[PDB]
């Protein structure tokens, strides 16, 4: 029944958010509105299995059965779910932020992922309630975290994001040591969308560059305090400036209706979807001048 993209070509797009935005956001909450029941026909059998309440975050925020991905041996569950890309499966792993009883799990599934790149968008606490644990090193000192070893090369504060870079080694697979880059945005509003459109513009492309820069990315992992709303409004902004760079038309629709296929509230805001068009005219307003 339902529309599954709303293609739009760049030279229409000032106009047609315009439209959207009339009459307080009429037609733009009946077009999100259309995107409510995508992937809501599908379980989350095993993540709600007696034996994995304390390895959720949120008892209510589970991966899909059909998306999950699972880690080695007897005890496969992780709070994690696969998105494929355009052109091959497993483009990113969206999950929770790790409880100090995950931590090591989520350091297990990037080892035997090939993961290269973590981009997480939540602070550890937000309004006093605690949203992530500092999973990872807190100085240059090695350490197991499981059967792995981490340890931190590099920790850059930047004014809105820090980046930080980490060798592991795991058991032997397709690599026997590796190196981690981890992009920490640090100025998520703690309800709300960021501000301008321009911050988050510049960390997803600076975080596109790194990506596309590697011999051998894997998936990239991205993660805020659920896996919800905010890491959704990333991976969707990501493929959005991508088509820009490759299309004449744009699909905003399209790009979350293909996240929600995947993983429960991936773009879970009105406020979040607007974001999204914020950031596709302020590219476009540019380009057209230029
Ligand atoms: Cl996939
Ligand atoms: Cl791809």
């Given at each position: ?5 709303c293609?739009?070509k ?60 699972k880690?080695?041996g007897?005890?496969?569950?992780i709070?994690?779910?696969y998105?494929?890309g ?6 990113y ?8 009883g ?20 939540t ?24 059967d ?6 590099s920790?850059?504060?930047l004014?809105?994001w820090?980046?930080r870079?980490?060798?592991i ?17 640090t100025?998520?509003p ?12 510049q ?7 790194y ?24 991976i969707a ?10 299309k ?16 429960v509230?991936?773009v879970?805001t ?15 307003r ?5």
């Amino acid at each position: 029944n339902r529309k599954t993209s709303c293609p739009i070509k760049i030279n229409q797009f000032e106009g047609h958010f315009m439209k959207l935005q009339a009459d307080s956001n009429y037609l733009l909450s009946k077009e999100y509105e259309e995107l409510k029941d995508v992937g809501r026909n599908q379980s989350c059998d095993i993540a709600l299995l007696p034996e994995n309440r304390g390895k959720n975050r949120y008892n209510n925020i589970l991966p899909y059965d059909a998306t999950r991905v699972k880690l080695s041996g007897g005890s496969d569950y992780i709070n994690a779910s696969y998105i494929p890309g355009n052109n091959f499966r497993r483009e990113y792993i969206v999950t929770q932020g790790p409880l100090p009883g995950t931590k090591d799990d989520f350091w297990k599934m990037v080892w035997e992922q090939n993961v290269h790149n973590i981009v997480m968008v939540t602070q550890c606490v937000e309004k006093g309630r605690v949203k992530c644990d500092h999973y990872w090193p807190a100085d240059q000192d090695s350490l197991y975290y499981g059967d792995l070893i981490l340890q931190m090369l590099s920790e850059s504060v930047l004014p809105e994001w820090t980046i930080r870079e980490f060798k592991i080694c795991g058991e032997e697979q397709l690599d026997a040591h590796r190196l981690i880059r981890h992009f920490h945005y640090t100025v998520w509003p703690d309800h709300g969308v960021p501000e301008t459109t321009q911050s988050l513009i510049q960390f997803v492309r600076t975080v596109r560059d790194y990506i596309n820069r590697s011999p051998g990315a894997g998936p990239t992992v991205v993660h805020c305090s659920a896996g919800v709303g905010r890491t959704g409004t990333f991976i969707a902004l990501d493929r959005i400036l991508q088509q820009l760079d490759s299309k004449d038309s744009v699909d905003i629709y399209g790009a979350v209706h293909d996240l929600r296929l995947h993983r429960v509230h991936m773009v879970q805001t009105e406020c979040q979807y607007v974001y999204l068009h914020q950031c596709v005219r302020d590219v476009l307003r540019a380009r057209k001048l230029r």
